Ligand SMILES: *[C@@H](O)[C@H](CC(=O)O)NC(=O)[C@@H](C)n1c(=O)c(NC(=O)c2ccc(Nc3cnc4ccccc4n3)cc2)cn(C)c1=O
């Protein structure tokens with residue numbers, strides 16, 4: 001006795017549109033042998049990590065970063081993940097947190113993970129809170145992959161690991177002119 | 181009056197399974213607004229480039245490379261591309277060839293391109309024929325993207341550019357053991 | 361007994377721009393890429409796999425109007441489609 | 449008049465292995481990755497877009513039996529599906 005014009009956004013999934021049982025069964029019946037398996041909703045322990053730097057020792061404050069933390073935390077919870085939020089870390093601190101994250105026993109009873117990094121960035125990688133041109137504090141994307149791979153995170157073997165990065169990758173505007 | 185058990189592999193598409201008119205129309209009717217447009221078969225001038233190094237000054241011969249040239253050339257022709265094949269180049273020669281390729285007027289009347297690089301490789305990139313540990317001769321993947329981007333190859337603006345690389349990316353076997 | 365496994369597999373990284381280029385962030389509305397990604401996951405998690413959702417995010421950045429950025433997917437080793445099945 | 453365009457867009461790179469790792473080549477049969485890619489394009493160009501075909505190639509490398517390699521897609525900025533429509 002619900003009204004389709006009044007969408008329910010009041011559940012744990014919030015504003016994320018739901019996958020109906022019919023659509024879920026349709027998605028599987030098309031290419032089951034080529035979809036990542038999902039664990040029982042009642043017992044799985046999905047985890048996600050958000051690392052976000054807003055305050056820096058030598059570079060400008062990333063005003064609006066709290067809005068990004070809010071949106072990504074709520075989205076990841078809406079998708080069924082328990083979210084850890086770590087803020088204002090050096091690249092060394094990020095490495096320690098990522099290593100701790102890979103060591104979490106919940107991954108053994110999880111089907112996937114999301115890692116979200118949001119900071120200042122340069123071509124080389126993501127800025128840690130102590131970054132300066134003089135003494136760099138950079139976490140490279142290669143290090144993130146290494147810490148979460150089949151060897152360093154065996155609990156996530158054969159499970160999708162989605163990495164989201166919000167950070168400049170240099171100083172260019174990324175455009176060229178053309179005759180319209 | 182054909183026999184379905186006797187597949188025709190005798191046309192310009194060779195062993196590539198054909199997309200029926202019905203399947204082509206079905207593919208479009210599903211997500212037309214999100215597919216790359218394809219140009220008229222009768223007038224398009226699709227190009228593809230294959231760069232392959234088999235013979236080197238200071239490192240071992242890549243025996244079997246001719247089999248790779250055969251397979252990729254025939255495949256790209258089967259898919260409708262006119263294929264240029266350039267062999268045993270230094271990284272400088274590869275840059276010159278790629279720049280010449282980006283300058284080809286046929287791209288203006290083409291809908292896409294394929295670039296295929298096949299050589300020895302290290303973590304840094306693809307080996308040119310003169311490569312040695314002492315004096316490196318490396319073409320980086322970043323340089324390939326730069327030479328074919330919207331600025332350096334305006335004729336391919338908004339057109340898919342598929343790059344295929346066959347080359348080692350280091351010295352590791354890429355495995356870890358686990359308890360089965 | 362012991363068995364060999366690929367050391368790196370089943371990853372996908374999605375960056376806010378192409379190499380060498382900036383991404384945009386507003387002081388009260390947040391990062392453009394983040395806001396766009398959340399909108400796309402909310403609308404398309406029910407019916408599209410993550411690689412498809414990421415393509416749709418890239419497509420929404422296509423017509424640059426003053427703050428150009430092209431999100432890029434990197435180092436992809438997903439061997440299967442990753443459907444989120446929201447609600448399941 | 450002049451209009452701005454993304455400097456880098458509509459690319460896809462497909463490498464024969466993951467970073468740091470080798471790829472295999474046989475003296476008379478050629479490169480394993482090349483042979484696998486040709487087989488997959490031949491079978492699936494008619495019905496799958498290139499990103500999907502590349503995923504299927506990665507999936508075929510999954511069970512490593514002595515010569516492990518995991519092809520990887522890189523620096524992806526395709527905003528649309530690239531269907532080859534063989535025969536058209
Ligand atoms: C690179 O790391 C950073 C981004 C980051 O810290 O993650 N980039 C910069 O700091 C740099 C390019 N930059 C800006 O981003 C500025 N931004 C703006 O001028 C600006 C951004 C966005 C809007 N508008 C807008 C509208 N709707 C939105 C909806 C959702 C989310 C965001 C939205 N943003 C307007 C202006 C400015 N400067 C000076 C700068 O250096």
Ligand SMILES: *[C@@H](O)[C@H](CC(=O)O)NC(=O)[C@@H](C)n1c(=O)c(NC(=O)c2ccc(Nc3cnc4ccccc4n3)cc2)cn(C)c1=O
Pocket residue numbers: 242299300301346347348349470471472473474477478479480481483484515
């Ligand atoms: C890194 O750049 C190179 C590859 C290249 O030159 O592109 N890698 C090496 O040279 C290195 C890892 N390597 C080999 O590759 C050797 N290969 C073998 O031992 C070997 C390869 C493949 C097969 N089998 C096989 C079966 N069916 C096939 C079908 C199609 C195509 C290929 C097929 N290959 C058996 C053995 C050996 N050495 C010594 C070596 O250094």
